[PDB]
Amino acid sequence: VFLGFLGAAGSTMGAASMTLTVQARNLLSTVWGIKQLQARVLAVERYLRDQQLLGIWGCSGKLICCTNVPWNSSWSNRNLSEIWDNMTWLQWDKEISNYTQIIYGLLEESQNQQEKNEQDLLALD
Amino acid sequence: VFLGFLGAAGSTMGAASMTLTVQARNLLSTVWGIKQLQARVLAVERYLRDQQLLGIWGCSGKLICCTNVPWNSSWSNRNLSEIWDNMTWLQWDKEISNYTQIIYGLLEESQNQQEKNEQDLLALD
Amino acid sequence: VFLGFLGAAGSTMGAASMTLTVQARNLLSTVWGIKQLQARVLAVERYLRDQQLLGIWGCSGKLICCTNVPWNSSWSNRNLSEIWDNMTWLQWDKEISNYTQIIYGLLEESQNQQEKNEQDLLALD
Amino acid sequence: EVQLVETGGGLVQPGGSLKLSCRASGYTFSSFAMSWVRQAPGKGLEWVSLINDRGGLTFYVDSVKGRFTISRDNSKNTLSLQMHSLRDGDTAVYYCATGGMSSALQSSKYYFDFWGQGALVTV
Amino acid sequence: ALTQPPSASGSPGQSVTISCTGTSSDVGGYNYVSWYQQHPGKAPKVIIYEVSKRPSGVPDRFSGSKSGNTASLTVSGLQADDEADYYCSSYEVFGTGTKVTVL
Amino acid sequence: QVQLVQSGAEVKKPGASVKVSCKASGYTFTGHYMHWVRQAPGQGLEWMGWINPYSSGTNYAQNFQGRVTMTRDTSITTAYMELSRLRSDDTAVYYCARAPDYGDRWDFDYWGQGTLVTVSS
Amino acid sequence: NLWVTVYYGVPVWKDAETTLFCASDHNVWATHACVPTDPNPQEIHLENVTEEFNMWKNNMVEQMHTDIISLWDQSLKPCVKLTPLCVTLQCTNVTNNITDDMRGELKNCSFNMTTELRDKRQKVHALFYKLDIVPINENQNTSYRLINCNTAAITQACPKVSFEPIPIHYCAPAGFAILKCKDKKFNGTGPCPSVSTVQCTHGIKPVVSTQLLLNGSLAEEEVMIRSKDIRNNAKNILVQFNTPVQINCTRPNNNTRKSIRIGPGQWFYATGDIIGDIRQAHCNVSKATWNETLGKVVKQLRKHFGNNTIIRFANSSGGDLEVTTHSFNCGGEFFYCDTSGLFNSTWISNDSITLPCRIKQIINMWQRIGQAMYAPPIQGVIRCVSNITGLILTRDGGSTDSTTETFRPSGGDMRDNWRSELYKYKVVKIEPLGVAPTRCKRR
Ligand SMILES: *[C@@H]1O[C@H](CO)[C@@H](O[C@@H]2O[C@H](CO)[C@@H](O[C@@H]3O[C@H](CO)[C@@H](O)[C@H](O[C@H]4O[C@H](CO)[C@@H](O)[C@H](O)[C@@H]4O)[C@@H]3O)[C@H](O)[C@H]2NC(C)=O)[C@H](O)[C@H]1NC(C)=O
Ligand SMILES: *[C@@H]1O[C@H](CO)[C@@H](O[C@@H]2O[C@H](CO)[C@@H](O)[C@H](O)[C@H]2NC(C)=O)[C@H](O)[C@H]1NC(C)=O
Ligand SMILES: *[C@@H]1O[C@H](CO)[C@@H](O)[C@H](O)[C@H]1NC(C)=O
Ligand SMILES: *[C@@H]1O[C@H](CO)[C@@H](O)[C@H](O)[C@H]1NC(C)=O
Ligand SMILES: *[C@@H]1O[C@H](CO)[C@@H](O)[C@H](O)[C@H]1NC(C)=O
Ligand SMILES: *[C@@H]1O[C@H](CO)[C@@H](O)[C@H](O)[C@H]1NC(C)=O
Ligand SMILES: *[C@@H]1O[C@H](CO)[C@@H](O)[C@H](O)[C@H]1NC(C)=O
Ligand SMILES: *[C@@H]1O[C@H](CO)[C@@H](O)[C@H](O)[C@H]1NC(C)=O
Ligand SMILES: *[C@@H]1O[C@H](CO)[C@@H](O)[C@H](O)[C@H]1NC(C)=O
Ligand SMILES: *[C@@H]1O[C@H](CO)[C@@H](O)[C@H](O)[C@H]1NC(C)=O
Ligand SMILES: *[C@@H]1O[C@H](CO)[C@@H](O)[C@H](O)[C@H]1NC(C)=O
Ligand SMILES: *[C@@H]1O[C@H](CO)[C@@H](O)[C@H](O)[C@H]1NC(C)=O
Ligand SMILES: *[C@@H]1O[C@H](CO)[C@@H](O)[C@H](O)[C@H]1NC(C)=O
Ligand SMILES: *[C@@H]1O[C@H](CO)[C@@H](O)[C@H](O)[C@H]1NC(C)=O
Ligand SMILES: *[C@@H]1O[C@H](CO)[C@@H](O)[C@H](O)[C@H]1NC(C)=O
Ligand SMILES: *[C@@H]1O[C@H](CO)[C@@H](O)[C@H](O)[C@H]1NC(C)=O
Ligand SMILES: *[C@@H]1O[C@H](CO)[C@@H](O)[C@H](O)[C@H]1NC(C)=O
Ligand SMILES: *[C@@H]1O[C@H](CO)[C@@H](O)[C@H](O)[C@H]1NC(C)=O
Ligand SMILES: *[C@@H]1O[C@H](CO)[C@@H](O)[C@H](O)[C@H]1NC(C)=O
Ligand SMILES: *[C@@H]1O[C@H](CO)[C@@H](O)[C@H](O)[C@H]1NC(C)=O
Ligand SMILES: *[C@@H]1O[C@H](CO)[C@@H](O)[C@H](O)[C@H]1NC(C)=O
Ligand SMILES: *[C@@H]1O[C@H](CO)[C@@H](O)[C@H](O)[C@H]1NC(C)=O
Ligand SMILES: *[C@@H]1O[C@H](CO)[C@@H](O)[C@H](O)[C@H]1NC(C)=O
Ligand SMILES: *[C@@H]1O[C@H](CO)[C@@H](O)[C@H](O)[C@H]1NC(C)=O
After folding, report:
1. Where is this region: Fusion peptide (chains A, B, C) (predicted)?
2. Which of A120, B12, B119, G268 is most exposed, with minimal Cβ within 10 Å?
3. Cα–Cα dist A24/A37, whole Å
């Protein structure tokens, strides 16, 4: 499982988006019998929290998920070639750390809950 | 995350159904280093059990999920206006505690497994 | 919950595929207060790992999941009647233990990631 | 008490881009779905478009599906209809009405309960 | 403060009723009224607790109720092992005592 | 088996002190209030007081306040009641009784045998 | 017509009992293990919610009781054991100038103590209080023993561990919530129409005391009288004040700490001597403030016992020293103060008070078996200012006069003290999953 882990860390975002399963499979597994257990418990919570995010968004069970949130040029004005072909995910995460929680809120609030309510109302027509 | 938690506990079920993400995000996180760890483990199991229910039903990854189980007037004869507009979720849960496991069984047994088998058979046509 | 557990272990695979929820619901729950806690933690990890497999495949939230991996006669030349009507799951698992990781790799690599990328490209047409 | 009052109606040429606006009062605007229904001078009633209570789901007849755009503002209590590429067949009195659908949490409202004065449109 | 008749009497097969009367007002203080049976020579045993509950192992014959200030026991099915002293209690007050004579 | 075993009968003169013990067994001693109730021969039941065997706190009836002392020992699981300055009418059967729980209920589930104390000249 | 719709995230809860964890801003209550607190903790008001609360069945009190006892044992575990101190003591009366209040309370005891070398002994002398020393024999041999030597082993408290109570917060784990009753006239039990949800409780100082509640919470408007059953004299009455009464407790004696090496790395801390005169420890309360506070308490008790009933306060009728006196820990010293002048009054419906205090250095906290603690002396003079925020009273039963009610101090069960702070908090578990009819059908 470990093999290939973080190998595309220095690759472009496009090239590094085809190895998502390699990172995904590496997120899940005498006081030293307690502390290690705590670490195991910690890993589970982190995994579940990320999965919870994917579930409050319409992204449950997916590694690549398309959404209805428009991109804002304030978050980033770079082209697609300057993000996917000429840029790595670490650089992108360093720039967009500043805006992550606005995008997360837009993902959580407007799009998924309005879409879910609209499916609730279309299903009773 | 905590902010707004249980705020719609006294609101109507309709008004309180638009805040589901607020409760959903608050379900997941020296003998005192063990007992607290047990509590953390306990929370995970509860979360997973509820998610497991949603998965055995056709509701995985959703906060609002529509099903094929007809409502039975024996469970409740109240109108929709007397449930969603003039009633809270605590009152509803107190009345329908008596019938919860019948609805859960109907959700688990007839609808999801028959639908899943019917998709298994439609996919081979 | 326990009632009916593994009851179809000796039944045919077809008959034993209608009781999947019974096994699914039984996977989730002083040094003896630590060891038992470790066991609980262990169960969670196993559950999550299996769920993770189902998520890296296109099978999240499903107990029966159809895929795009063709069956290979090298894995098994038996008919459908000799698998579903005249055979149990333990016998099938004993034969196909030898081939499980090839099928798992084909499930993980070609079909789901190519399908996910193709949906990523169809959604922007 | 429910008072629907349409405006923006008048005369336009083929290819015109005409905007009508229906103002509502006397009831909770955001709690009801709204529709536009048209009546040609010499014919009966024809349903044109439907918008839900939240303004997120819109439905149209095939004959206007790519030309008309129903919209609503729930703070201002204003329903609106923007018609582009108006055709000779679109000459009619347009009425705004309350009803046509409801959310899953309400009773069925598959009918038009309240109606407007009407607004003449001559293409 | 919990007056009781001085004596009561019954015949084998029929039923007897003992009454306890409280001088004080109702003031919802009579929720916890217990009854005791003192076979001569021994220590009292509890027949009713909280007006109309029975300790496990007590026969259904003993059964009391309440009405405002008053509160009563009913020994229905009187035998010959009912020659005891019956006392009503409200917390610390004890009843005055009724000697139930079998006939 | 829950048991309460009291000391044997005693003969006292007026002006003396008498101390009656009650050994408890079969339950958690600190979890139930201990009550002392006396019954003179031929008369009804008279409640004397209670002791909290956990906190050691006591409560005496007004008839006995100033004369009666109640104590406990959790090491040997024993409750004690001492009456000073006995009088002629003080002759009675002194019972210890266990409350069904921690001071909420006054319907005494278990009683001791009863210690007969007679006071005479 | 209607179909089952599943909702996840439903704001519904059930009564629950769980293990609440800790938050706090060389301490008895650990504090390092306890999680650090978070600034500006969120409080959310639940509008249109009425929730039943029972203080008298609140598992937060039982958990706090267990946690404080366990923390005390954990603090005592690594400290020096004083088992060698069970030797014959030769005690005489102190020869300094001693006030009559203290004549015979403090004894000068000499004994043969061990040293770092197992083949040597030292002749040493320490000052001990009379409430910690027992005559070995009835005869006047002047040979005495420590009070605990026959029944329990004694451990010295670590001098570096402060006995000052610090506020602690009890926090619910994920999936659970703490509901706080915000009604300001809440009698303890029943529906609460004004409810909020909190991450954690307020800062609760686990102050250990009897008969008086110290450094607690005040009632918002009026004195509150809370009892599980006000007609049951076997249950305690918790009185919560709306204004604090300031109490000033001092140990006037200047004190020294003498260090005696009893083992290779074990030190025993003796009082040694007193510089200057010897005076009795005592507490002062304002007479007028206490008298108005008692007037308010009587005014509130008449709401339960009658407008025309006489309310009398009298001293404790019995029990051990911890419950017959106002016991408390301040400055590191344990005071047992005589409250017979606080509760000495009849109230018919129509300066300062000095409470003498005795000191013990050998303490058996709670009522554990076979474990006692020696309290090392504190150097200097201890001056302590505390707020009295409530009382624990017991009503005299078996009264032969129905026109008068008599109340006496009680205590000794610390669950009644910590229930005076946790009375407004309830723990519930969240039930986020629910079903309801809607018109939406699955395709
Ligand atoms: C109710 O609350 C009040 C106010 O918080 C509280 O009184 C306070 O008590 C503490 C601890 O006894 C006092 O702090 C001490 O003050 C003296 C003054 O000289 C210092 O010497 C002390 O420090 C020495 O001891 C410490 C260990 O205790 C060592 O860590 C330190 O190095 C020193 O050796 C210490 O600071 C505080 O001054 C009072 N406050 C007032 C206003 O009097 C009271 O105790 C609480 N009541 C109860 C019953 O708990
Ligand atoms: C306690 O007793 C000891 C002796 O057992 C006293 O110590 C002696 O005190 C006198 C005072 O004049 C000194 O001269 C001696 O040298 C001391 N002897 C030792 C062995 O130290 C001590 O002072 C007494 N303390 C009190 C407070 O009474
Ligand atoms: C590193 O960059 C070079 C170009 O400089 C590229 O050819 C190579 O594939 C990159 N490595 C990885 C692991 O993507
Ligand atoms: C983009 O962000 C800015 C603030 O940075 C905001 O004012 C603007 O409305 C946003 N644009 C869109 C289209 O959401
Ligand atoms: C977009 O592409 C052009 C191509 O010439 C490049 O020079 C430019 O830097 C890019 N712009 C941004 C904002 O990334
Ligand atoms: C966000 O702000 C930080 C400073 O607070 C800055 O380092 C970062 O680069 C900002 N974002 C962008 C896109 O520059
Ligand atoms: C509480 O009820 C009132 C009507 O009595 C309503 O206006 C208010 O919005 C409700 N509060 C919440 C939080 O829903
Ligand atoms: C509704 O419940 C009753 C029992 O309460 C049952 O007999 C009846 O068949 C149910 N109706 C439907 C339509 O499932
Ligand atoms: C349904 O609505 C009517 C409207 O008049 C109301 O009076 C009635 O109580 C409701 N019925 C039920 C069963 O809730
Ligand atoms: C279910 O039964 C319980 C008593 O067992 C009762 O309290 C509850 O209200 C019942 N359900 C309904 C809808 O009344
Ligand atoms: C076991 O096999 C027999 C036929 O030999 C069959 O009738 C029976 O149903 C099987 N048992 C189970 C549990 O499937
Ligand atoms: C089946 O497996 C064999 C090896 O066992 C492999 O060579 C062959 O290509 C596989 N066939 C298909 C259709 O994938
Ligand atoms: C397939 O079915 C036939 C039917 O006659 C059976 O005899 C044969 O064994 C089966 N073949 C395999 C490969 O399982
Ligand atoms: C796989 O190989 C093992 C021996 O390594 C053998 O026991 C097993 O039966 C093989 N698979 C099949 C289908 O025979
Ligand atoms: C010593 O003090 C005691 C008090 O414990 C007293 O009774 C005794 O008389 C004193 N003896 C003297 C001064 O000799
Ligand atoms: C200490 O021991 C000596 C003998 O070494 C003995 O005479 C003396 O009395 C002892 N002292 C005490 C205070 O017991
Ligand atoms: C609180 O009020 C309830 C009734 O709502 C009552 O049972 C209880 O005794 C009251 N407590 C006090 C101290 O008055
Ligand atoms: C206590 O005595 C010491 C002796 O050094 C002195 O420094 C200190 O000031 C005295 N303290 C008081 C409060 O008198
Ligand atoms: C207490 O009051 C008395 C009154 O005489 C006074 O002398 C003493 O100093 C006071 N004590 C304190 C600690 O304030
Ligand atoms: C207690 O001490 C304070 C100063 O710390 C003083 O103002 C107050 O009057 C004193 N109270 C009493 C009752 O002596
Ligand atoms: C205490 O207050 C009461 C008010 O009820 C008053 O009658 C009495 O004189 C006061 N006593 C003192 C000493 O202030
Ligand atoms: C209580 O006061 C009386 C005098 O009224 C006294 O004899 C008795 O010893 C005191 N009790 C306590 C515990 O202080
Ligand atoms: C109690 O009050 C009486 C007067 O009723 C007084 O003589 C006595 O000194 C007081 N006792 C105490 C201990 O303050
Ligand atoms: C006593 O109460 C007052 C008013 O509530 C407060 O300011 C003060 O800090 C409190 N004192 C202590 C020692 O807690």
Report:
1. 1-15
2. B119
3. 21
- Return the beta strands (E) in chain F as ranges: 3-6, 10-12, 18-25, 34-39, 45-51, 58-60, 68-73, 78-83, 92-98, 110-111, 115-119
* Orientation angle between helical segments C32-56 and B32-56, nearest 10 degrees: 30
Tell how far the Cα of B53 is from the centroid of ligand 11, in angstroms. 30
β-pairing, G13-15 with G425-430? Answer: antiparallel
Domain that holds residue A75: 6-122
Give the angle C36-C37-C42 at the CA atoms, nearest 5°.
Answer: 95
Centroid of ligand 15 to alpha carbon of G93 (angstroms): 6
Count other Cβ atoms within 10 Å, centred on residue G169: 23
Q: Crossing angle of helices A32-56/B32-56, nearest 10°?
A: 30
The answer as to whether C35 is a domain residue is yes
List E residues 22-81 in contact with G (Cβ-Cβ < 8 A).
24, 27, 29, 32
DSSP secondary structure string, B4-41? TTTGGGGS-HHHHTT-HHHHHTTS---THHHHHHHHHH
Please say whether the beta carbons of G205 and G234 come within 8 A: no
b/e G43-67 (16+ beta carbons within 10 angstroms → b): ebebeebebebebbebbbbebbbeb
Q: Say if A1 falls within a structural domain.
A: no
What amino acid is encoded at B30 in this protein?
Answer: T
What is the C-alpha to C-alpha distance for residues C65 and G300, in angstroms, rounded to an integer? Answer: 70
Sorted by sequence, the CB contacts under 8 Å of residue B82 that are 6+ apart come out as none
User: DSSP letter at F9?
Assistant: P
In order of F14, F19, F21, F118, G117, the CA distances from F85 in angstroms are 6, 12, 18, 13, 57
3-state secondary structure (DSSP) of residue G332: coil
**DSSP-H helix ranges across G306-375:** 321-324
Radius of gyration of chain A (CA): 18
Tokens of G162: 């402060």
Residue C33 lies in a domain: yes
Asked whether C72 lines ligand 12 (CB < 6 A), one says yes
Distance CA G2, CA C108 (A): 41
For this experimental structure, what is the resolution in angstroms?
Answer: 2.8
Residue C92 forms part of a structural domain? yes
Region of residue A87 (phi > 0: left; psi between -120 and 50: alpha; otherwise: beta)? beta
- Strands E7-10 and E98-102, by their bridges, are parallel
- At D122, is the secondary structure helix, strand, or coil? strand
Chain A positions with Cβ closer than 8 Å to C:
18, 20-21, 24-25, 28-29, 33-34, 37, 40-41, 44, 47-48, 60-64, 66
Element (H, E) at E76: strand E70-76
Say if residues E98 and E4 touch (Cβ distance below 8 Å). yes
Q: State whether the beta carbon of G110 lies less than 6 angstroms from ligand 16.
A: yes
Determination technique used = cryo-EM
Q: What number does the ligand 14 atom closest to the CA of C96 have? A: 13
Give me the amino acid identity at F117: V
Q: Where are the beta strands (DSSP E) in B49-115?
A: 64-70
Number of domains in chain B: 1
* Interface probe with E: pick from G228, G229, G230, G231, most Cβ of E within 10 Å: G231
User: So where are chain D's domains?
Assistant: 3-123
Give the tokens for residue B15.
Answer: 């008004």
Instruction: Assign domain D3-123 one CATH number from 2.60.120.260, 3.30.460.10, 3.30.450.40, 2.60.40.10.
Output: 2.60.40.10
φ, ψ dihedrals at D60, nearest 5°? -140, 160
What is the rounded distance in angstroms from the CA atom of residue G275 to the CA atom of residue G271?
11
The pair of structure tokens assigned to D72 is 């609503």
Which residue is associated with the tokens 């108006």? D86
Contacts of E66 (CB under 8 A, 6+ apart): E30, E33, E51, E52, E72
